[PDB]
């Protein structure tokens, strides 16, 4: 791509979820998800191999659907409040529908079914667009009507996006998927803690945003897709390991890694409000999210894999890779933690 | 067979440095981290700490509970009264429940 | 001149240290006069 | 350059300092009830004027 | 005497993309390190006492 | 407590910073002088207790388990001097501060006086032990043993956390004094039943309990020295803290969910003894021991007596000094045969005579040789338990028989007996290891020798 | 200014920077038949960078100080070793193999960078595209394994396509006596416990197999050395040589910047030739890792990034 | 007891039965297909939950 | 107009269903999104001109529109799919599963 397109591409994808946050319309909410969805379709099939034309042909189908199931919404309540918003007196039916889409466009149980096939077979950048940017914009639609929605159907969607998301994770080896399932896990954390509180909710995306993104960075300083790529990062960037698990513990919620911060507040929110059986299942899938947090951590940096005779060459080279902001995404996500008062409101 | 260095054998340490303490190869950090170890450890710990806490005095106040226990038994001996009550609180300023 | 090819980092980028070290004085100074700014603000509204 | 090779010997002691510090920094923080307790409520001599800092 | 590190039998079993090799799953393969002519046969004639085999790239 | 928080914080850039020749020696001294500024929570010349700040206070309870840690860390130090000499300089600074991070954060969760608090650095600590133990420890068997010791002991974890937050909005604060002055009766219904065992399943787990004991075990064999020293001396003790601590706010119907815990802890202490005389291994004989001694400390703090309250203190502190002697003792034999086997080693008596007397010694305070705090720890428990029940004499005593025979087995087939004359590589001895033997034992000598000070909160 | 993105817009465009000698040529043949001679007489003439066979120590002399490092640090594989015994345990003969053709992928990524960037054409010696050769002679002669090939294909078709191919291939055909005659009047001792077998197995993967793939998409100048021996008449052919073929003729300028991209970045370069696969051969193990890589890193210059080696004479590393 | 049923009763139970499930639940054809009539089920399904909690 | 409605929302509904329920055609699948998106824009004109909301008569221009460009994304994706595998079979598509 010229820089023409990749400026054209680059600000649409921008432009799409900052339309549908600033937006106080249905209708440009709706409009600002496919700015999104259309501006990031090139970006998915920019490596033009078959996979990356799959990926991208599951992901458009399923994000045309469910943006279909959004302006049914949008034209229903249109219908029957003479407005463009779902002020107060929407049907619980609309409503419920609205959920269901954009839970779809999120990629949540048991709407996950595309999201790790999706992230793998794109490159990691891409990963790391979707899996952080593409969904500040249903989270925004999902925040803007909060106290209309239906609580045991969203409980319902996150207790079994958590556990799809911890039992995934467990499976796999590949880095994509890794993160997929995690990040369907998250959105399960967010969704939960959605109908009560939605300033934890935008704190649980902020957390999970700063610690997906050195995720993603390391993963691209060395195209490690694989447990066993990971794993000899001793040998080509020794000087990563120590963040790496520190990251790892920080989405597994281990105090006193900040990223104990989201689940623990969450928990408190959700045990303010009466739903402790609710709480203890999210907190035992946790659990698992973290078990395979701990699996990955063991391969890549508390053991030391063997290594290949090429290793020798690509140590020889230098490299001016890693940014600037990655430390202090790092830091910001591993060492915040007695900054909780100030980071929840 | 995957490339791998050869399993070490350990050396006989003192063969090399027969003043050897535990401490590092070469005797002068050995010998100066043993006397490191010898004076932080029992010089100035396990004998100033010893001190220090066999002079702290009343420790939770037994020998001033022993002084109010004698006070308290010569008062009561001296004008005939319980050295115990059988109640610690005094019953006119307790309002028990009717039934 | 020990390194075969030119380093990236042989020479001081005297830009950026100019940029970063005049960064780092203004918003000390700036955080400073703010501080003092609302030291005296926060004392003329309570009558302190 | 005895100063610059033995450096790395004040921080500890500097540490040491620095916590007795905020210890009393927190115990004159803690002052919402000096020479207020039922049990040690007593007039202040003419020579001081708290009864403990 | 030394610490173990994984051989090649514990670096080899995280490959296979499943963790868990069962009857339903044991047939899969890893995704790739990488993630990765038709043309006309034309007939020129009765438009006639010519054949072309014409070659088109369209 | 901020004064011993903050230069032990300083240790760290010390660490770093220090000469690749120097950073064992300056480490340790301060470390040392990290210990003689702890002892200053002593001056206990009043029942009132010392609260430093709104966050941080010492106890009769919390200030031996403080002492206890900051004592160690030199200790720990000292003994992972030598299995580090042929490591990377910035791995070894790496383990130091691994070390350093553990004795900060356990002086911060004995010392907190909020429940919250003390479970943020109960797993603070918990991450540190899983990093020595997985890159450090030598067999291959250390990954699993790393996620058992984590697993169980974070789904003991989360009932925990609920529990709390659940108190924490039933009451307001979760602050430890308000929480033991406003305690309020509970219904002894069964949402009251569930959270005190919520409340109860995180540190009876940490202990370890009786059936989820699994764990210690492999954790302890396949963990360096230092951990199995963090393990052994203070973890289980910070899981009896974390009882004690919490056990205030549960009357009544802690009368009789008391029960099948007590049981399982007299049961498991005599399975556990049983295991100690069919044991193959050193390290496994020494961490089952050690899940029997903290089965004695369950029952005594399940029975609630004050008498048992005190036993469990002197048995907590006795048992982490004489668990730390035995792994260093144990430790010095692995270093120089280079196997685990309880039985490969017979005739070290005849080499080594000054390490056959420290093994003996350990070995006693072990089996509860008067006058020790061990003997006092376990003849209190024994006291408390039998005013509980009068048939609880029968266990004490077969867990009693069985630990003297367990303890002079050790010192049978470890020290006694011909020479296993093959061992050829049989270095003399460190004056590292022997004086890592002198400052465990000492101590116990000195609280043997004034026992007034580890009696805990009861008297 | 590093190149990149920007460098592209404010202008650094390759296609303005080409010339008719901005060519990529390549020179092929045997293991001692007038390669290294003919190649640098036609950079000379051509006004062309000249880049020999990449050896062993090839990223050494291009790394650090430029000095040959020892031979643990640079692949531990010889040459000589294979020679005496090309049959030995170790699996010398697939490490040999795998570093040369990295070493072979670096300096093709060194040379179109250099082509990329200044426009002066490259000529190099037995690029990437017929080391092959030496793997498929190896393999039919015992030397190797069917799981060594399967691994070298993997990482040649993981990493072939991504850069372009050259613009011509000059070969030149000998006769296996005559190498067997040149390689014992050249008088390296190892060097001469060689095979007839080998040279003809060397021989036939040219003919079969290199010289075909070359054909459809590049253009191929098979020499004699008497056709040869006199860098006029391939010089001649050269100038009157015409690129109608290949993908050199679809690149444009964001083509020729992604390219240069990716052969700057010499990490995404030997990405893929540190694949996790677990070959006996070329599998080292974390202890002989750990120990090979800590003395590398107490290599004098090689501790930290270049220009931040104090001990070298770096200086302001405070400043930057 | 405990190298045999402990270990049976608590933590290699717990592993078999999540391995179990997760084997089962991301055993997963690739097929978008069935991902669709699965989507087609969960919207049945949420619509039902809707008409029963009302 | 609600019998219309009905209707409308039926058809909506039908094409939803038959969008969820896979066939071996891509082409079908992307033709019952736009018997989704003509249900919707018959939904908002009739909705529109039944209120006399000449301010939101825009809005179904801008749901042709953007619908229209989603659609010629969705059709260039099928061109890609149908080049790489001869056929817009979508059981051809799922090498992605592991
Ligand atoms: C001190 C602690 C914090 C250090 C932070 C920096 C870390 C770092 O860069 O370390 C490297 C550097 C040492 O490197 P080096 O030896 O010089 O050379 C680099 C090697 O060549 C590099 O060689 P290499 O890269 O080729 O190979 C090494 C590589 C090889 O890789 C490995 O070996 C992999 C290891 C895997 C296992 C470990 C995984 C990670 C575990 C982390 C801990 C987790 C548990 C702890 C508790 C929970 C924490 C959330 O990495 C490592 O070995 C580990 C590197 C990091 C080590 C330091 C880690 C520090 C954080 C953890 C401890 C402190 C926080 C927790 C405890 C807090 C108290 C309770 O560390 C320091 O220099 C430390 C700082 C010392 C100076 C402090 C000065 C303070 C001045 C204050 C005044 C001025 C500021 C005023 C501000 C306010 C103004 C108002
Ligand atoms: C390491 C041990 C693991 C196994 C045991 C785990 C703890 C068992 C006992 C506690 C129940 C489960 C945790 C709940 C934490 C909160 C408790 C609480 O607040 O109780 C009062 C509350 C009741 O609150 P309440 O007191 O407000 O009650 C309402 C009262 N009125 C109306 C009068 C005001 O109890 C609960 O809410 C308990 C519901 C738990 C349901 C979910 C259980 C999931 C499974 C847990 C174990 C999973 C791991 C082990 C699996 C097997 C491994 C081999
Ligand atoms: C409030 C919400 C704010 C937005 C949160 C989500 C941000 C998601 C990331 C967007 C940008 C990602 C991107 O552009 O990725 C490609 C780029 C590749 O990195 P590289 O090519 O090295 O370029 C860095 C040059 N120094 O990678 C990058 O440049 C990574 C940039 C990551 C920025 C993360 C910001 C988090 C929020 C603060
Ligand atoms: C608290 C938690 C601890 C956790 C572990 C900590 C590990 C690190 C420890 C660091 C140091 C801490 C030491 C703690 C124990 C201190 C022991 C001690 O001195 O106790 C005081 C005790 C005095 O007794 P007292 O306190 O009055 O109580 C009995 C009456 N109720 O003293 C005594 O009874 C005697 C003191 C020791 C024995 C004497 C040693 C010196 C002997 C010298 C003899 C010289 C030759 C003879 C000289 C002439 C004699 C007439
Ligand atoms: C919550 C956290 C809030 C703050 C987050 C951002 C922290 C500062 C980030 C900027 C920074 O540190 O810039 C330093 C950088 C140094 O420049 P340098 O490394 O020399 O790179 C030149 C290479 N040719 O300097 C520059 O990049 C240019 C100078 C500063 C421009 C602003
Ligand atoms: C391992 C061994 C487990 C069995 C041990 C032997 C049986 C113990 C029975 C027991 O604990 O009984 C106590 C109590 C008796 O009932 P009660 O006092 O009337 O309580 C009224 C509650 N509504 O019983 C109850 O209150 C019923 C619930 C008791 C739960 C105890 C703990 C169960 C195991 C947790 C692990
Ligand atoms: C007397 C008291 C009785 C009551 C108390 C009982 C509970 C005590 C505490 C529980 C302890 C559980 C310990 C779990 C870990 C031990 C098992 C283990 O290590 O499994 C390892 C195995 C993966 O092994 P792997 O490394 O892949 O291969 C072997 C070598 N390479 O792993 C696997 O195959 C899968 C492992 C999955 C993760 C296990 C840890 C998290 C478990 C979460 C449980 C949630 C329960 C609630 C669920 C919702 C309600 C149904
Ligand atoms: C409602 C949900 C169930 C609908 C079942 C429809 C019939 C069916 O099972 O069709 C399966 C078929 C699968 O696609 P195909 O490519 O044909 O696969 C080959 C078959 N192995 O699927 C298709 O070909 C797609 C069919 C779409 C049909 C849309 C219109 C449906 C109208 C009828 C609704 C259901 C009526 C049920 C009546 C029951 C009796 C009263
Ligand atoms: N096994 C093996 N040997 C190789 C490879 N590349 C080069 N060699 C050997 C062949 C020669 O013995 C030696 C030097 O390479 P040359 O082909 O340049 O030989 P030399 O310089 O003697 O002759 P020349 O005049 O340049 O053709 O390296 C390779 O990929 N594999
Ligand atoms: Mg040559």
Same mark, same amino acid.
């Given at each position: 791509?010229?820089?023409?397109?990749?400026?054209?591409?680059?600000?649409?994808?921008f432009?799409?979820?900052?339309?549908?946050?600033?937006?106080?319309?249905?209708?440009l909410?709706?409009?600002?998800?496919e700015?999104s969805?259309?501006?990031?379709?090139p970006?998915?099939?920019?490596?033009?191999?078959?996979?990356?034309?799959?990926?991208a042909?599951?992901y458009?189908?399923?994000?045309?659907?469910?943006?279909?199931?959004?302006?049914?919404?949008?034209?229903?309540? %249109?219908?029957?409040?003479?407005?463009?918003?779902?002020?107060?007196?929407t049907?619980?039916?609309?409503?419920?529908?609205?959920?269901?889409?954009l839970?779809?466009?999120?990629?949540?149980?048991?709407? *996950?079914?595309?999201?790790?096939?999706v992230?793998?077979?794109?490159?990691?950048?891409?990963g790391?667009?979707?899996?952080?940017?593409?969904?500040?914009?249903?989270?925004?639609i999902?925040?803007?009507?909060?106290?209309?929605?239906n609580?045991?159907?969203?409980?319902?969607?996150?207790?079994?996006?958590?556990?799809?998301?911890?039992?995934?994770?467990?499976?796999?080896?590949? /880095?994509?998927?890794?993160?997929? %399932?995690?990040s369907?896990? *998250?959105?399960?954390?967010?969704?939960a803690?959605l109908?009560?509180?939605?300033?934890?909710?935008l704190?649980?995306?902020?957390?999970?945003?700063?610690?997906?993104?050195?995720?993603?960075?390391?993963?691209?300083?060395?195209?490690?897709?694989?447990?066993?790529?990971?794993?000899?990062?001793?040998?080509?960037?020794?000087?990563?390991?120590?963040?790496?698990?520190?990251? =790892?513990?920080?989405?597994?919620?281990?105090?006193?890694?900040?990223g104990?911060?989201?689940?623990?507040?969450?928990?408190?929110?959700?045990?303010?409000?009466?739903?402790?059986?609710?709480?203890? $299942?999210?907190?035992?899938?946790?659990?698992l999210?973290?078990?395979?947090?701990?699996?990955?951590?063991?391969?890549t940096?508390?053991?030391?894999?063997?290594?290949? #005779?090429?290793?020798?060459?690509?140590?020889?080279?230098?490299?001016?890779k890693p #940014?600037?902001?990655?430390?202090?995404?790092?830091?910001m996500?591993?060492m915040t933690?007695?900054?909780?008062?100030?980071?929840?409101? | 067979?995957?490339?791998?260095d050869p399993?070490?054998?350990?050396?006989n340490?003192?063969?090399?440095?027969?003043?050897?303490?535990?401490?590092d190869?070469?005797?002068?950090?050995?010998?100066?981290?043993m006397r490191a170890?010898?004076?932080?450890?029992?010089?100035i710990?396990?004998?100033?700490?010893?001190?220090?806490?066999?002079?702290?005095?009343?420790?939770?106040?037994?020998?001033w509970?022993?002084?109010?226990?004698?006070?308290l038994?010569?008062?009561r001996?001296?004008?005939?009264?319980?050295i115990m009550?059988?109640?610690?609180?005094?019953?006119?300023?307790?309002?028990?429940?009717?039934? | 001149?020990?390194?075969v090819?030119?380093?990236?980092?042989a020479?001081p980028?005297?830009?950026?240290?100019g940029?970063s070290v005049?960064?780092?004085?203004?918003?000390?100074?700036?955080?400073?006069?703010? *501080?003092?700014e609302?030291?005296?603000?926060?004392?003329?509204?309570?009558?302190? | 350059?005895?100063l610059?090779?033995?450096w790395?010997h004040?921080?500890?002691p500097?540490?040491?300092?620095?916590?007795?510090?905020?210890?009393?920094?927190?115990?004159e923080?803690?002052?919402?009830?000096?020479?207020?307790?039922?049990?040690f409520?007593?007039?202040?001599?003419?020579?001081?004027?708290?009864?403990?800092? | 005497?030394?610490?173990?590190?994984?051989?090649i039998?514990?670096?080899?079993?995280?490959?296979?993309?499943?963790?868990?090799?069962?009857?339903?799953?044991?047939?899969?393969?890893?995704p790739?390190?990488?993630?990765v002519?038709?043309?006309?046969?034309?007939?020129?004639?009765?438009? +006639?006492?010519?054949?072309?085999?014409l070659?088109?790239?369209? | 407590?901020?004064?011993?928080?903050?230069p032990?914080?300083?240790?760290?850039?010390?660490?770093?910073?220090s000469?690749?020749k120097?950073?064992?020696?300056?480490?340790?001294?301060?470390?040392?002088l990290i210990?003689?500024?702890?002892?200053?929570?002593l001056?206990?010349?009043?029942?009132?207790?010392?609260?430093?700040?709104?966050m941080?206070?010492?106890?009769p309870?919390?200030?031996?388990?403080?002492?206890?840690?900051?004592?160690?860390?030199?200790?720990?130090?000292?003994?992972?001097?030598?299995?580090?000499?042929?490591?990377?300089?910035?791995?070894?600074?790496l383990?130091?501060?691994?070390?350093?991070?553990?004795?900060?954060?356990?002086?911060?969760?004995?010392?907190?006086?909020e429940?919250?608090?003390?479970?943020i650095?109960?797993?603070?600590?918990?991450?540190?032990?899983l990093?020595?133990?997985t890159?450090?420890?030598?067999?291959?068997?250390?990954?699993?043993?790393?996620?058992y010791?984590?697993? !169980?002991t974070?789904?003991?974890?989360?009932?925990?956390?609920?529990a709390?937050?659940?108190i924490?909005?039933?009451?307001?604060?979760?602050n430890?004094?308000?929480?033991?002055?406003?305690?309020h009766?509970?219904?002894?219904?069964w949402?009251?039943?569930?959270?005190?065992?919520?409340?109860?399943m995180?540190?009876?787990?940490?202990?370890?309990?009786?059936?989820?004991?699994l764990?210690?075990p492999?954790?302890?064999?396949?963990?360096?020295?230092?951990?199995?020293?963090?393990?052994?001396?203070?973890?289980?003790?910070?899981?009896?803290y974390g009882?004690?601590?919490?056990?205030?706010?549960?009357?009544p119907?802690?009368?009789?969910?008391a029960?099948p815990?007590?049981?399982?802890?007299?049961?498991?202490?005599?399975?556990? @003894?049983?295991?100690?005389l069919?044991?193959?291994?050193?390290?496994?004989?020494?961490?089952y021991?050690?899940?029997?001694? /903290?089965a004695?400390?369950?029952?005594?703090?399940?029975?609630?007596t004050?008498?048992?309250?005190?036993?469990?203190?002197?048995?907590?502190?006795?048992?982490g000094?004489?668990?730390?002697?035995?792994?260093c003792?144990?430790?010095?034999?692995?270093?120089?045969?280079?196997?685990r086997?309880?039985?490969?080693?017979? +005739?070290?008596?005849?080499?080594?005579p000054?390490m056959?007397?420290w093994?003996?010694?350990?070995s $006693?305070?072990?089996?509860?040789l008067?006058?020790s705090?061990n003997? /006092?720890g376990?003849?209190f428990?024994?006291?408390?338990?039998?005013?509980?029940?009068?048939?609880?004499?029968?266990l004490?005593?077969?867990?009693?028989?069985?630990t003297?025979?367990?303890s002079?087995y050790?010192?049978i087939?470890?020290?006694?007996?011909?020479?296993?004359?093959?061992?050829?590589?049989?270095?003399?001895?460190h004056?590292?290891?022997?004086?890592?033997?002198?400052?465990?034992?000492?101590?116990?000598?000195?609280?043997?020798?004034?026992?007034?000070?580890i009696?805990?909160?009861?008297? | 200014?590093?190149?990149?993105?920007?460098?592209?817009?404010?202008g650094?465009?390759?296609?303005?920077?080409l010339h008719?000698?901005?060519?990529?040529?390549?020179?092929?043949?045997?293991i001692?038949?007038?390669?290294?001679?003919?190649?640098?007489?036609?950079?000379?003439?051509?006004?062309?960078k000249?880049?020999?066979?990449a050896?062993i120590? %090839?990223?050494?002399?291009?790394?650090?100080?430029?000095?040959?490092?020892?031979?643990e640090?640079?692949?531990?594989?010889?040459?000589?070793?294979?020679?005496?015994?090309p049959?030995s345990?170790?699996?010398?003969?697939?490490?040999?193999q795998?570093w040369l053709?990295?070493?072979?992928?670096?300096? !093709?990524?060194?040379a179109?960078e250099?082509?990329?960037?200044?426009?002066?054409?490259?000529?190099?010696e037995?690029?990437?595209?017929?080391?092959f050769?030496?793997?498929?002679?190896?393999?039919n002669?015992?030397?190797?394994?069917?799981?060594?090939?399967?691994?070298?294909?993997?990482?040649?078709?993981?990493?072939?396509?991504?850069?372009?191919?050259?613009?011509?291939?000059?070969?030149?055909?000998?006769?296996?006596?005559?190498?067997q005659?040149?390689?014992?009047?050249?008088?390296?001792?190892?060097?001469?416990?060689?095979?007839?077998?080998?040279?003809?197995?060397?021989?036939?993967?040219?003919?079969?197999?290199?010289?075909?793939?070359?054909?459809?998409?590049?253009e191929?100048?098979? !020499?004699?050395?008497?056709?040869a021996?006199?860098?006029?008449?391939?010089?001649?052919d050269?100038?009157?040589?015409? &690129?109608?073929?290949?993908?050199?003729?679809?690149?444009?300028?964001?083509?020729?910047?992604?390219?240069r991209?990716?052969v700057?970045?010499?990490?995404?370069?030997?990405? &893929?030739?540190?694949?996790?696969?677990?070959?006996?051969?070329?599998?080292?193990?974390?202890?002989?890792?750990?120990?090979?890589?800590?003395?590398?890193?107490?290599?004098?210059?090689?501790?930290?990034?270049?220009g931040?080696?104090?001990?070298?004479?770096?200086?302001?590393i405070?400043?930057? | 007891?405990?190298?045999?049923?402990?270990?049976?009763?608590?933590?290699?139970?717990?592993?078999?039965?999540?391995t179990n499930?997760t084997?089962?639940?991301?055993?997963?054809?690739? =097929?978008?297909?069935?991902?669709?009539?699965?989507?087609?089920?969960?919207?049945?399904?949420?619509?039902?939950?809707? @008409?029963?909690?009302? | 107009?609600?019998?219309?409605?009905?209707?409308?929302?039926?058809?909506?509904?039908?094409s939803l269903l038959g969008?969820?329920?896979f066939?071996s055609?891509?082409?079908?699948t992307?033709?019952?999104?736009?018997?989704?998106?003509?249900?919707?824009?018959?939904?908002?004109?009739?909705t529109?001109? #039944?209120?006399?909301?000449?301010?939101?008569?825009?809005?179904?221009?801008?749901?042709?529109?953007?619908?229209?460009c989603?659609?010629?994304?969705?059709?260039?994706?099928?061109?890609?799919?149908s080049?790489?595998?001869?056929t817009?079979?979508?059981?051809?598509?799922?090498?992605?599963?592991?």
């Amino acid at each position: 791509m010229n820089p023409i397109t990749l400026a054209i591409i680059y600000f649409t994808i921008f432009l799409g979820p900052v339309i549908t946050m600033s937006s106080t319309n249905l209708m440009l909410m709706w409009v600002g998800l496919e700015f999104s969805l259309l501006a990031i379709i090139p970006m998915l099939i920019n490596k033009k191999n078959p996979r990356s034309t799959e990926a991208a042909t599951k992901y458009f189908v399923t994000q045309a659907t469910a943006s279909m199931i959004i302006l049914l919404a949008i034209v229903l309540n %249109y219908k029957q409040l003479g407005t463009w918003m779902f002020q107060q007196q929407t049907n619980g039916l609309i409503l419920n529908m609205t959920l269901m889409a954009l839970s779809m466009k999120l990629g949540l149980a048991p709407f *996950h079914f595309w999201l790790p096939e999706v992230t793998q077979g794109i490159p990691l950048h891409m990963g790391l667009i979707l899996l952080t940017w593409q969904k500040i914009a249903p989270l925004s639609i999902l925040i803007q009507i909060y106290p209309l929605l239906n609580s045991t159907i969203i409980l319902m969607l996150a207790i079994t996006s958590i556990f799809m998301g911890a039992w995934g994770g467990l499976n796999q080896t590949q /880095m994509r998927k890794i993160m997929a %399932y995690s990040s369907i896990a *998250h959105m399960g954390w967010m969704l939960a803690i959605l109908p009560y509180n939605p300033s934890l909710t935008l704190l649980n995306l902020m957390i999970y945003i700063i610690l997906t993104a050195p995720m993603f960075m390391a993963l691209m300083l060395n195209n490690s897709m694989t447990i066993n790529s990971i794993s000899l990062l001793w040998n080509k960037t020794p000087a990563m390991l120590t963040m790496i698990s520190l990251m =790892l513990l920080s989405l597994g919620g281990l105090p006193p890694l900040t990223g104990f911060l989201p689940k623990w507040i969450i928990i408190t929110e959700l045990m303010k409000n009466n739903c402790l059986i609710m709480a203890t $299942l999210m907190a035992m899938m946790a659990l698992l999210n973290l078990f395979f947090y701990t699996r990955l951590i063991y391969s890549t940096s508390l053991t030391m894999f063997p290594t290949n #005779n090429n290793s020798k060459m690509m140590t020889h080279q230098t490299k001016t890779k890693p #940014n600037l902001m990655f430390s202090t995404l790092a830091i910001m996500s591993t060492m915040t933690l007695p900054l909780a008062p100030q980071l929840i409101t | 067979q995957w490339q791998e260095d050869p399993e070490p054998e350990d050396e006989n340490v003192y063969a090399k440095n027969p003043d050897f303490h535990g401490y590092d190869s070469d005797p002068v950090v050995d010998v100066w981290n043993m006397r490191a170890v010898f004076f932080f450890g029992f010089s100035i710990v396990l004998v100033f700490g010893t001190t220090f806490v066999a002079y702290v005095p009343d420790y939770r106040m037994q020998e001033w509970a022993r002084r109010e226990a004698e006070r308290l038994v010569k008062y009561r001996e001296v004008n005939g009264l319980p050295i115990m009550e059988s109640n610690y609180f005094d019953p006119s300023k307790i309002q028990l429940p009717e039934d | 001149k020990f390194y075969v090819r030119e380093p990236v980092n042989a020479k001081p980028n005297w830009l950026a240290v100019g940029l970063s070290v005049g960064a780092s004085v203004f918003m000390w100074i700036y955080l400073i006069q703010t *501080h003092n700014e609302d030291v005296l603000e926060y004392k003329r509204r309570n009558g302190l | 350059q005895l100063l610059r090779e033995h450096w790395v010997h004040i921080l500890v002691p500097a540490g040491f300092v620095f916590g007795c510090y905020l210890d009393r920094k927190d115990d004159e923080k803690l002052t919402a009830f000096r020479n207020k307790s039922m049990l040690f409520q007593r007039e202040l001599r003419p020579n001081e004027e708290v009864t403990w800092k | 005497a030394r610490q173990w590190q994984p051989d090649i039998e514990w670096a080899e079993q995280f490959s296979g993309a499943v963790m868990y090799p069962s009857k339903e799953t044991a047939h899969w393969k890893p995704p790739p390190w990488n993630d990765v002519v038709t043309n006309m046969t034309l007939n020129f004639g009765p438009q +006639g006492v010519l054949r072309l085999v014409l070659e088109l790239s369209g | 407590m901020l004064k011993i928080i903050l230069p032990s914080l300083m240790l760290l850039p010390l660490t770093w910073l220090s000469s690749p020749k120097k950073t064992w020696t300056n480490v340790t001294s301060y470390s040392f002088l990290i210990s003689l500024t702890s002892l200053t929570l002593l001056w206990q010349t009043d029942e009132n207790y010392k609260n430093f700040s709104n966050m941080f206070s010492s106890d009769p309870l919390s200030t031996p388990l403080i002492i206890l840690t900051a004592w160690l860390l030199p200790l720990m130090l000292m003994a992972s001097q030598n299995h580090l000499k042929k490591d990377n300089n910035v791995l070894q600074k790496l383990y130091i501060s691994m070390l350093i991070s553990l004795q900060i954060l356990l002086i911060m969760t004995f010392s907190a006086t909020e429940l919250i608090m003390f479970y943020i650095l109960f797993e603070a600590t918990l991450i540190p032990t899983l990093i020595i133990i997985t890159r450090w420890g030598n067999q291959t068997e250390r990954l699993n043993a790393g996620i058992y010791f984590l697993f !169980y002991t974070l789904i003991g974890s989360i009932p925990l956390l609920i529990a709390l937050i659940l108190i924490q909005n039933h009451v307001g604060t979760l602050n430890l004094m308000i929480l033991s002055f406003t305690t309020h009766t509970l219904d002894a219904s069964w949402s009251n039943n569930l959270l005190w065992l919520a409340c109860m399943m995180a540190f009876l787990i940490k202990m370890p309990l009786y059936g989820v004991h699994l764990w210690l075990p492999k954790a302890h064999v396949e963990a360096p020295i230092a951990g199995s020293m963090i393990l052994a001396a203070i973890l289980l003790k910070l899981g009896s803290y974390g009882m004690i601590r919490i056990s205030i706010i549960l009357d009544p119907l802690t009368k009789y969910m008391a029960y099948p815990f007590i049981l399982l802890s007299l049961w498991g202490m005599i399975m556990t @003894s049983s295991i100690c005389l069919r044991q193959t291994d050193l390290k496994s004989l020494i961490a089952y021991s050690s899940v029997s001694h /903290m089965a004695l400390v369950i029952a005594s703090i399940m029975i609630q007596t004050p008498w048992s309250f005190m036993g469990a203190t002197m048995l907590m502190i006795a048992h982490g000094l004489t668990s730390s002697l035995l792994f260093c003792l144990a430790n010095s034999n692995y270093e120089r045969i280079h196997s685990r086997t309880m039985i490969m080693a017979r +005739g070290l008596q005849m080499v080594f005579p000054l390490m056959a007397t420290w093994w003996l010694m350990a070995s $006693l305070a072990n089996l509860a040789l008067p006058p020790s705090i061990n003997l /006092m720890g376990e003849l209190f428990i024994t006291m408390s338990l039998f005013s509980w029940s009068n048939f609880t004499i029968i266990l004490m005593g077969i867990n009693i028989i069985i630990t003297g025979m367990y303890s002079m087995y050790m010192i049978i087939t470890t020290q006694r007996g011909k020479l296993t004359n093959h061992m050829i590589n049989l270095q003399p001895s460190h004056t590292r290891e022997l004086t890592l033997m002198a400052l465990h034992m000492i101590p116990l000598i000195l609280l043997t020798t004034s026992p007034k000070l580890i009696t805990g909160l009861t008297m | 200014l590093r190149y990149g993105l920007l460098a592209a817009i404010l202008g650094d465009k390759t296609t303005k920077k080409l010339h008719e000698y901005s060519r990529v040529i390549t020179v092929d043949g045997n293991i001692c038949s007038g390669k290294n001679k003919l190649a640098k007489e036609i950079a000379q003439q051509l006004g062309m960078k000249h880049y020999p066979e990449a050896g062993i120590q %090839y990223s050494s002399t291009t790394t650090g100080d430029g000095r040959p490092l020892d031979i643990e640090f640079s692949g531990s594989c010889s040459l000589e070793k294979f020679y005496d015994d090309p049959k030995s345990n170790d699996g010398n003969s697939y490490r040999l193999q795998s570093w040369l053709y990295a070493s072979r992928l670096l300096q !093709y990524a060194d040379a179109l960078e250099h082509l990329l960037s200044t426009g002066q054409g490259v000529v190099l010696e037995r690029s990437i595209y017929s080391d092959f050769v030496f793997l498929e002679a190896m393999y039919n002669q015992g030397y190797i394994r069917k799981q060594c090939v399967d691994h070298y294909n993997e990482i040649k078709r993981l990493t072939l396509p991504e850069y372009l191919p050259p613009h011509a291939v000059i070969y030149i055909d000998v006769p296996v006596p005559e190498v067997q005659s040149r390689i014992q009047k050249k008088g390296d001792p190892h060097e001469m416990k060689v095979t007839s077998a080998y040279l003809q197995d060397i021989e036939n993967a040219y003919k079969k197999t290199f010289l075909p793939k070359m054909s459809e998409m590049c253009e191929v100048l098979v !020499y004699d050395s008497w056709e040869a021996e006199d860098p006029t008449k391939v010089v001649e052919d050269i100038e009157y040589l015409k &690129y109608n073929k290949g993908p050199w003729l679809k690149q444009d300028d964001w083509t020729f910047h992604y390219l240069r991209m990716l052969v700057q970045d010499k990490t995404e370069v030997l990405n &893929y030739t540190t694949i996790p696969v677990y070959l006996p051969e070329i599998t080292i193990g974390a202890h002989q890792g750990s120990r090979i890589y800590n003395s590398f890193r107490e290599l004098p210059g090689r501790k930290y990034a270049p220009g931040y080696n104090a001990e070298v004479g770096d200086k302001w590393i405070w400043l930057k | 007891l405990d190298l045999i049923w402990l270990e049976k009763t608590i933590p290699k139970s717990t592993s078999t039965l999540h391995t179990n499930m997760t084997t089962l639940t991301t055993n997963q054809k690739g =097929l978008i297909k069935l991902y669709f009539m699965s989507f087609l089920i969960n919207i049945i399904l949420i619509i039902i939950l809707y @008409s029963i909690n009302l | 107009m609600p019998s219309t409605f009905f209707n409308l929302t039926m058809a909506f509904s039908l094409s939803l269903l038959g969008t969820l329920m896979f066939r071996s055609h891509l082409m079908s699948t992307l033709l019952c999104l736009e018997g989704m998106v003509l249900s919707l824009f018959i939904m908002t004109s009739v909705t529109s001109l #039944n209120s006399n909301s000449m301010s939101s008569m825009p809005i179904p221009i801008t749901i042709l529109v953007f619908a229209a460009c989603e659609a010629a994304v969705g059709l260039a994706l099928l061109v890609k799919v149908s080049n790489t595998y001869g056929t817009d079979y979508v059981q051809n598509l799922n090498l992605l599963q592991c």
